[PDB]
Each structure stands twice: as C-alpha cells, then as structure tokens.
Amino acid sequence: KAKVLLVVDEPHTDWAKCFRGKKILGDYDIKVEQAEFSELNLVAHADGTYAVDMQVLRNGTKVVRSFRPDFVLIRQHAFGMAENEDFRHLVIGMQYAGLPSINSLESIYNFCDKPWVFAQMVAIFKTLGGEKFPLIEQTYYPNHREMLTLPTFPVVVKIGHAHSGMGKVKVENHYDFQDIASVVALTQTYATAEPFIDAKYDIRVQKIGNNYKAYMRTSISGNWKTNTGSAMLEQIAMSDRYKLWVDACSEMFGGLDICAVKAVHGKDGKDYIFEVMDCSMPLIGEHQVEDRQLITDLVISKMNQLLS
Amino acid sequence: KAKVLLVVDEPHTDWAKCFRGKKILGDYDIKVEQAEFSELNLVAHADGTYAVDMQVLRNGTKVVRSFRPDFVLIRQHAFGMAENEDFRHLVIGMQYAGLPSINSLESIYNFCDKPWVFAQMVAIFKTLGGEKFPLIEQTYYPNHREMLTLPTFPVVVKIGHAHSGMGKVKVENHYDFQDIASVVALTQTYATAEPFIDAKYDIRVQKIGNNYKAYMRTSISGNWKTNTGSAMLEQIAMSDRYKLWVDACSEMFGGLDICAVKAVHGKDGKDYIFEVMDCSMPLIGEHQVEDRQLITDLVISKMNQLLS
C-alpha cells in the first residue's frame, strides 16, 4: 500500500511528479494529495484520529474528497493580514493531530509574526557579534504610540505581518513618518523601521536539508523592495561567512529544514542581514527543478525516520 | 546599584513588599516596577537598547515614568478577545529586547492559543498513555464548517481564546449545538468540544519552581464552570500520579517555571485532565502568601542566574 503525503502548495508545481516511483520504509509507495490552504479543512481529536477535507476545483468541477495524511510538506505561507490569508487555525489543527512535517509545525507556527522571528536573529547577533552576523539595525514599535521615538531617515517601515512586499513603505522624512504612524494607529498593529540601505547587491543564502546555495544580483531597491524582476538571482560561491549566517538561523524554533537568509550589500562595502524565510520561501533561479528535487529527498528521508 | 524588575500584575498584590530588602549578584538592590499590561508600552532596538513606559495615576492623574527593566515577572494573561485584553505586541517586544523572564517569553507566547497548548498535552497523552495521563476526549474544529458532524451530548464547547472560561458553553442537544456553531461562524474563530463530565470533584496540581501542591474543589460544575471563585476548596496530598501529570506538562515550550494542570474526577471514578495553566494562573487556597514567597525566591534565583 502507500503512505499519504499532503503538500500545501499552488497548482503550478506538480509535486506528484516529483514523488513518482519513490518508496519509503522499504516497500511503501507515496500517494500525494496536493492543495492550497484555501481549499483545505480538517477536524482532529485528542484520541489520535483526524480527517482532512479538500474541496478542489478541477478541470471544470467542484471536487471534494477526504483523506488522512501521514505527513505534510508545507510550501505556502500560512499567515498574512490581507483578506483570506489567515490559516493559523489549520496549522494548529495539524499540530493537534500530531502530524509530522517539513518544516516542523512548531517552526511554522512561530513564523507567524515577523518581529518574533527577528527577535531570534537579534539573539544570534548578540551571540555571534556583527563582524560574523551583520544584522541590520531595526526598531520594533508595539503600536503607533511609540513611533514618536524617531529613527534616522530614510527608513523602510514594515507594518504588521505580510509577505510579497505587503505593508512595507519607504519613509524619507519626519512629516511622512508621522503620517505613516497615524496609519499604523488605524491598523491597530505593530511596525518595524530599519535604515533603507543604498544597495550595491542583494544576497540570498539558502539551506535545504544539507544543501547550501548563495545567490547574488545587482540591487535596484535594496531592502525596500524587489522592483519588476529586472535581474534574476544568480548562484555564486558559498563562503564560510555565508554558511554561518544560514546555519545559525536554521537552529531557531527547534530547527528549520528549509530556510533562507536575505541580506543587502551596501555601496558602503558592508553586508546587512534583514530577513529569514522558512519553508514557504519561493524557489529562484535556474535550479528550481533541482531544489524541488532536494526538497523531495528531504521529505522521503523524514518520512522514513518518523513513520512506521 | 540596583537591577529593575518589571512585574506585570494587578494592583492588589504588592510585589514590591515581597522583594523588599532582597539582594542580587551580592550587592545589588532590586527595584520593583509594577503595572498592568494596559498601562505599559515599550520600544526595542536590534542594537540591544530598549525602554519601557508606564502610565501612572499618582500626582497628575496621567503620570508617565520610563525605565529599563533587567528582568520581568508576568502574572497577567497577555491574550484574550475581550475589549483591550490583547497584549501579544508587548510580549513580542520584550522578546525582541532579549528580556529574561518568568515564565520564559517563549512559553508565554505559545500559550496564546488554548488548542495549541492542548496539542502539547495530546502528544504527552500518546507518549505516556491514558493509564498515567488521562487526557479528556476533545475535538478541535478549525472553524464552524467542521461542526456539522455532531458529537455525543452533553458537551462543553470552548469558543475561540479567552481565559476565565469566557467563551465556554454547555450544550445538550443538536439544536443548541447548531446555534453555537453559528456563533462560532460569527466570531470567525476555532472551537473545541469535550464531553461534559458529571463530576464528583475538581483537582488542580500546581508547580512553582520545585514546589508542588494539589488542591481539590468539590462541586458538579466539572469542566464547565472553572476558574470561578472557591467558596469551597481544600488541599490534598501529592501522589506520584499527580506529580507526573504536572511534571510532564511543565516540560512544554522549553519549560514552564510556574504552571498547573486541572482535572475533574468523574462520578465514574475516572480522572479527566482538561486544562494546563501557565504563569498567569491565579493563586488559590489558604497558602497564597506562601506561594507568592515561592514565586519571589524563584525570581531571585533566576535573576542571579541570568544577570550581570
């Protein structure tokens, strides 16, 4: 028979293809169920039983089906403040069911608040020092009332929690900072402000299991945004410097199997680490195929370790 | 020479009295700043600097003092859905600042969602088995749509996340269950349902550092009306059975310095563990002054361990 693997990812990636013919536990096959978070639901019980509901719109028809996954690979962001982007209830349900997964449900749950993740990077920065781990300066404001404490301009202000550049604004002077603070008051959430780096290059160091890759590219908008995919991220040599950055970040929340550190190299000759991404990190460059391959092997390795 | 201890607790408990005359690191005095979450704010920086602001109502009706705590003791619930009960942003800010505390900020943060905490007890249940850890049967519904499948009545349905039992309702037939399911829909949150236990008595096993106490409250209220006043409560002898329950629960989220497990003993002569409380647990019984003294020693021990 087979072990069921639930993969939460968009339809543009066909994970069933990646796991074809692949066996675990010696003789078991893997049946892949794939869906986006918006199409999933579940119920879980303290006694160990649970069932996942999937309503998939396929080739012209509202499809329904139920199943009991044995493992889960999560490739989609589970949070976000925009409309219909909050799936924390599903992450809690999977942990309640005791589902093993990549990344671990513990880590995914803790990646919900970006400044909470950044707090783990600040502790690493204190342990290793800036020479080895150049964390960007950043200020955390619990709400709008503390934004009377001004940062040095220009800064990039990031409001609440959200991906794909959502909620990030570049602020160049006090007057516009005051206006942004009044907007943070409306949203009733927290915000962060970090210096806007006049950047030379963007850098991403990724770790998938035991595989590492570093990519760099000319930076057009630094740590503010990525503007209209002008330059593709190109792989460069892995250095011992870069490896330490991602190995150190990968230890948080019990360990991240898939993660990436983003940094900018400024025209001032310095590196500034400003973000860590987990298993929902998009795949980039000419190696998506190969990276999906590495993720597939990682998943098989884990199902063999944890399942029975 | 003094270290500042921020204690987040209501005004009736005068923690400054518990710490008067106590020293840390040999010759430093302890300066206690006490306030409730609603009167506090802060700003934190990745470079390590941070500051807390407390709204005072002494000579000015709207006083405002600032300080830099070295350690924090949290005795108030930091979450909750009622009017101005949500302080997750301050918890995040204290962790961003790297503030040591009791209980740990990591554990406090993870106690925000009751079913997430319960998910840890389900894992303990699988490990130890029911003879040793009699976890109550419970079902987790990520949202109202999974509540179509009806449970066996009567049940206690817990809606969303709030303490003091807020949001708990006893449901006896599917008509009322359907109305509660519509309230869950209205609140856009999750819910849990567990059998309503016809109870002989209540049991609470607490652990403060390495001190343990077991208390029994007799009533039929069972797992429906909890936390409420104790017009009738009494201590009892600890047993290896009870100690294992709280010790196993105290290991979650990196370790809980202060916690308690609640259970009801059924008229059927069986125990049902249904809740774990962390450092915001109310102090009960006649030994409340002894308990505060135990919490005070724990805080001094920890400050000596983590400060310089």
Side-chain angles (χ1 to χ4, degrees):
Chain A
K1 295 76 169 186
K3 289 299 198 179
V4 186
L5 166 67
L6 167 68
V7 178
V8 184
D9 199 359
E10 297 170 289
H12 43 58
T13 288
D14 173 24
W15 288 99
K17 269 197 196 71
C18 292
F19 286 96
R20 286 191 186 181
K22 298 287 190 190
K23 319 289 173 177
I24 65 186
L25 304 167
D27 58 302
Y28 286 68
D29 300 67
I30 296 163
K31 175 180 186 171
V32 174
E33 294 289 350
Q34 188 177 326
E36 282 189 64
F37 271 126
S38 64
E39 314 163 317
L40 292 160
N41 210 333
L42 67 75
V43 58
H45 307 274
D47 61 30
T49 64
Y50 57 87
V52 170
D53 307 39
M54 183 200 283
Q55 314 211 302
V56 293
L57 185 62
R58 284 205 169 193
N59 296 302
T61 300
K62 299 179 179 179
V63 184
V64 186
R65 75 219 255 55
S66 191
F67 53 95
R68 183 199 132 101
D70 296 293
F71 198 99
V72 193
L73 160 62
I74 294 192
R75 286 285 302 140
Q76 184 179 337
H77 291 98
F79 320 96
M81 307 189 326
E83 313 170 43
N84 284 24
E85 267 170 45
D86 173 16
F87 302 106
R88 185 174 89 284
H89 60 304
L90 295 186
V91 172
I92 288 163
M94 292 185 278
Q95 185 67 296
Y96 194 106
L99 276 177
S101 66
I102 284 158
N103 273 352
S104 73
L105 294 175
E106 161 181 13
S107 69
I108 291 170
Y109 180 84
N110 280 273
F111 256 74
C112 179
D113 283 302
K114 180 192 165 197
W116 182 250
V117 173
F118 197 91
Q120 297 292 323
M121 304 159 77
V122 175
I124 287 163
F125 173 64
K126 273 187 190 64
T127 298
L128 303 172
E131 134 57 44
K132 294 175 160 195
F133 190 84
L135 186 60
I136 195 170
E137 300 204 304
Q138 189 179 83
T139 297
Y140 169 76
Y141 303 101
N143 50 50
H144 78 281
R145 298 189 273 100
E146 288 285 348
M147 293 182 76
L148 293 177
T149 290
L150 305 177
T152 292
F153 300 108
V155 282
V156 176
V157 175
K158 286 142 152 165
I159 301 175
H161 37 292
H163 340 281
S164 305
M166 194 168 292
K168 290 166 60 169
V169 173
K170 174 170 54 68
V171 185
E172 307 194 303
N173 58 69
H174 185 213
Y175 303 130
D176 290 338
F177 192 68
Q178 288 172 56
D179 285 342
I180 289 311
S182 81
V183 173
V184 170
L186 304 191
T187 72
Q188 286 186 69
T189 190
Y190 48 71
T192 57
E194 65 199 49
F196 170 51
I197 304 306
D198 187 5
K200 200 177 184 119
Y201 316 106
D202 297 317
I203 292 157
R204 202 179 95 165
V205 183
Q206 60 175 58
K207 172 186 178 294
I208 293 176
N210 228 81
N211 181 265
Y212 301 78
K213 300 204 200 326
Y215 306 80
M216 156 192 280
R217 70 173 154 209
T218 282
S219 189
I220 299 160
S221 298
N223 59 317
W224 171 25
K225 63 187 178 176
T226 297
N227 194 218
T228 300
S230 187
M232 323 162 301
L233 224 21
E234 299 178 4
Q235 192 170 338
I236 59 174
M238 264 295 329
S239 64
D240 269 12
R241 172 170 179 72
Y242 291 160
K243 187 185 221 299
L244 176 48
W245 297 357
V246 78
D247 276 334
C249 295
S250 73
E251 289 172 9
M252 76 175 71
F253 304 136
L256 311 180
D257 296 292
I258 296 169
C259 68
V261 184
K262 302 189 218 194
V264 280
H265 184 80
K267 298 174 183 173
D268 61 2
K270 302 180 165 179
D271 295 308
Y272 295 95
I273 290 170
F274 67 88
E275 188 182 327
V276 171
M277 293 180 293
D278 66 343
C279 53
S280 58
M281 77 182 188
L283 298 184
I284 64 191
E286 318 195 319
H287 298 257
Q288 312 198 346
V289 180
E290 180 190 320
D291 282 324
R292 293 205 283 293
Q293 178 62 81
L294 295 165
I295 289 174
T296 292
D297 300 332
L298 177 62
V299 171
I300 285 160
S301 178
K302 243 66 176 180
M303 288 175 82
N304 276 316
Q305 173 180 167
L306 312 187
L307 300 191
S308 302
Chain B
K1 259 183 154 167
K3 293 301 185 174
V4 175
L5 169 67
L6 169 66
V7 175
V8 185
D9 200 1
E10 286 167 45
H12 54 298
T13 295
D14 169 29
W15 287 97
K17 184 187 157 186
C18 299
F19 290 88
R20 201 56 176 193
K22 303 302 187 88
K23 304 272 187 165
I24 49 196
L25 308 168
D27 58 344
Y28 283 77
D29 287 303
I30 291 168
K31 170 163 198 178
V32 173
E33 297 285 354
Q34 185 175 336
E36 296 184 54
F37 269 131
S38 69
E39 322 157 66
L40 294 158
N41 211 336
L42 64 76
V43 57
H45 310 270
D47 66 16
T49 57
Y50 63 83
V52 176
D53 297 282
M54 184 178 77
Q55 289 148 49
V56 184
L57 296 67
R58 184 62 61 63
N59 185 182
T61 304
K62 188 177 297 180
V63 187
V64 184
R65 40 198 286 132
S66 191
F67 53 94
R68 184 201 129 99
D70 293 291
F71 196 99
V72 192
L73 163 60
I74 293 189
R75 286 285 302 142
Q76 174 180 359
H77 283 279
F79 312 99
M81 318 176 60
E83 189 163 43
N84 197 38
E85 292 185 328
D86 173 20
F87 300 104
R88 186 173 91 280
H89 58 295
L90 298 181
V91 174
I92 288 168
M94 290 185 282
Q95 184 70 295
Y96 192 105
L99 277 174
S101 64
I102 281 150
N103 273 351
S104 71
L105 291 181
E106 160 183 14
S107 72
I108 292 170
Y109 182 83
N110 279 271
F111 258 74
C112 186
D113 283 307
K114 204 179 181 100
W116 184 249
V117 174
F118 196 95
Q120 295 286 320
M121 295 150 88
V122 174
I124 289 172
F125 182 57
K126 287 185 176 60
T127 295
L128 301 187
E131 325 197 324
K132 292 187 163 208
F133 191 81
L135 186 57
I136 193 168
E137 160 167 285
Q138 190 183 77
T139 296
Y140 171 76
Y141 304 104
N143 52 46
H144 74 295
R145 299 190 280 101
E146 288 289 354
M147 298 179 78
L148 288 192
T149 301
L150 310 162
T152 296
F153 302 97
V155 291
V156 175
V157 173
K158 173 43 155 64
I159 298 164
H161 43 300
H163 13 276
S164 311
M166 171 179 287
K168 287 171 72 178
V169 172
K170 185 170 105 300
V171 173
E172 315 153 330
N173 50 70
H174 82 290
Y175 283 132
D176 291 330
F177 189 74
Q178 281 178 39
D179 291 340
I180 298 297
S182 74
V183 180
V184 170
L186 175 170
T187 71
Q188 300 187 46
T189 189
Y190 50 66
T192 59
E194 63 204 46
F196 170 52
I197 307 304
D198 176 27
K200 190 188 173 198
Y201 55 91
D202 285 310
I203 295 160
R204 198 182 96 164
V205 185
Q206 62 176 59
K207 180 179 181 175
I208 292 180
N210 299 318
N211 179 267
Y212 303 76
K213 290 174 168 57
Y215 282 106
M216 176 206 280
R217 187 179 169 198
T218 299
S219 290
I220 307 178
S221 293
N223 53 329
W224 172 28
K225 296 181 193 152
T226 304
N227 292 293
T228 177
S230 300
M232 169 186 252
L233 182 56
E234 281 273 59
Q235 170 158 22
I236 59 176
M238 282 289 319
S239 63
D240 297 5
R241 183 174 170 64
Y242 289 161
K243 189 170 185 299
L244 174 48
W245 298 354
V246 78
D247 278 330
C249 289
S250 80
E251 302 174 356
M252 75 177 65
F253 306 134
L256 311 182
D257 297 295
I258 296 171
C259 65
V261 182
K262 295 176 157 171
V264 267
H265 186 75
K267 276 172 166 175
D268 49 53
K270 289 210 187 66
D271 294 305
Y272 298 96
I273 291 167
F274 67 94
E275 194 179 320
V276 171
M277 296 181 293
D278 69 342
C279 59
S280 63
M281 74 182 196
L283 296 185
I284 66 182
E286 299 163 302
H287 304 301
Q288 293 175 38
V289 164
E290 180 200 321
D291 280 350
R292 282 205 283 286
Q293 186 66 57
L294 295 167
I295 289 176
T296 292
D297 299 334
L298 177 64
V299 173
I300 285 157
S301 175
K302 282 296 177 174
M303 288 175 78
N304 280 315
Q305 182 190 330
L306 309 172
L307 304 185
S308 73

